[PDB]
């Protein structure tokens, strides 16, 4: 438990062993569980010394200790990571990636992961210094199972951080370079490696449809669905995020998701006790019901409409908003037969009960869905019966109240509904 003053005294000595002991003391100080004195270490001007120690091939222990200390400094605020980067640490860590000592290369991997995880600027800077090639060289083995577990986990997490963040998204050539190894890792058995690989894929699929296409071309969707059917929440969460991102794309990518059998997992997802899982799954379903009519039909065949009715009847309010969106997309793109099936499953009463919420957007979505169902009934001539249903569940009173809403669109649409049908 040295003081920063003693650490500085030792590091400023012309004795490599005293410097090593002071650097180890700094590492232990920065590795304590409560409030590491990162700012105090920075103010003492110690980062340049640690960076210089990173290059002492003659003394591997001081390399390791300084790498650990700099890793922990770079794990803090953006200003602290920036202090690490300004010391010239990026190229030193990249040079250490090829060290013959596995623990030192692993520490360099960790440090680069923190730096890249700061944000898109430092991510792209790490990429410009040439980290991807040595990082992937570390994983160029016939069987990943021969690598140490922690080493593989750290490599996967750092790679995921290189795939992370937008504005801008990672360089396309870098994504193309990394994706094959990402597929390999996505077929690994370790739960943490799988979780971090799924997170990386979720990052890569979060953007324009061209990036989604880069990912889907690798054939990972079946594996993503298999992982979606996993037991570990830390794996299901990123897998579900990636699947949702993918189905935000073209009808062909959504169809790739459907063909892999994803819908068969949604009975559980739409009833998952974790609210975030339910919300993400309902959002995915809403984007799926915004697709082609055969895709809505596949949603119907898997028996998911009753699950949407359930989520609409009882769930977190945000999940209910996602379900209202799903219903509006369904009724906007669906055939008259599918809309009638939706009505037969009991959508009217929950959709009308949700009109009492103090949220304008869900109100407008629900009114659009009601208009679509009424158009279907008109096409069938059952508008009268549907109005009877809406009146029995107390919904006519809700639309009558919406008449006097503080939003133009809401009042206008409620008026149109009551005058064109009621």
């Amino acid at each position: 438990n040295w003081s920063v003053e003693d650490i500085v005294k030792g590091i400023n000595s012309n004795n490599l062993e005293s410097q090593l002991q002071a650097t180890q003391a700094a590492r232990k100080l920065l590795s304590r569980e409560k409030q590491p004195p990162i700012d105090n270490i920075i103010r003492a001007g110690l980062i340049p010394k640690f960076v210089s120690f990173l290059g002492k091939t003659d003394c591997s222990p001081i390399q390791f200790e300084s790498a650990w200390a700099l890793t922990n400094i770079a794990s803090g605020t953006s200003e602290q990571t920036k202090a690490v980067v300004d010391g010239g640490a990026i190229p030193a860590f990249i040079s250490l990636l090829a060290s013959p000592h596995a623990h030192i290369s692993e520490q360099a991997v960790w440090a680069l992961g923190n730096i890249a995880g700061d944000g898109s600027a430092f991510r792209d800077l790490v990429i410009k210094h040439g980290a991807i090639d040595p990082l992937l060289a570390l994983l160029a083995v016939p069987d990943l199972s021969t690598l140490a577990c922690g080493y593989l986990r750290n490599l996967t997490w750092t790679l995921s951080n290189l795939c992370r963040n937008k504005n801008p998204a990672p360089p396309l050539d870098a994504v193309e370079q990394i994706l094959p190894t990402l597929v390999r890792l996505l077929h690994h058995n370790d739960p943490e490696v799988l979780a971090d690989s799924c997170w990386a894929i979720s990052y890569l699929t979060d953007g324009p449809n061209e990036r989604i296409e880069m990912v889907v071309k690798k054939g990972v969707v079946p594996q993503l669905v298999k992982l979606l059917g996993a037991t570990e929440l830390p794996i299901v969460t990123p897998a579900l995020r990636a699947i949702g991102n993918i189905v935000t794309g073209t009808d062909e990518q959504t169809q790739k998701v459907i063909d892999a059998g994803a819908l068969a997992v949604f009975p559980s997802l739409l009833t998952n006790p974790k609210t975030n899982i339910q919300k993400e799954a309902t959002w995915t379903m809403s984007n799926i019901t915004a697709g082609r009519q055969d895709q809505i039909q596949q949603v119907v065949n898997h028996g998911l409409v009753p699950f949407l009715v359930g989520v609409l009847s009882k769930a977190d309010f945000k999940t209910q908003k996602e379900a209202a969106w799903a219903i509006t997309n369904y009724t906007s793109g669906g055939t008259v037969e599918q809309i009638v099936y939706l009505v037969h499953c009991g959508i009217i009463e929950p959709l009308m009960n949700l009109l009492s919420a103090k949220d304008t957007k869900i109100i407008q979505v629900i009114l659009d869905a009601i208009s679509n169902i009424f158009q279907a009934a008109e096409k069938l001539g059952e508008t009268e019966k549907l109005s009877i249903m809406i009146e029995e569940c107390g919904g006519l009173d809700k639309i009558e109240a919406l008449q006097r809403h503080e939003n133009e669109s809401v009042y206008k649409a409620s008026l149109n509904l009551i005058e064109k049908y009621f």
């Binding site: 922990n72 794990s75 995880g117 951080n161 935000t248 919300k279 984007n287 915004a290």
Partner: peptide
């Protein structure tokens, strides 16, 4: 993310 070493709607 950062780690310390111890010891269609595109948006929802």
């Amino acid at each position: 993310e950062k780690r310390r070493k111890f010891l269609k709607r595109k948006v929802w």
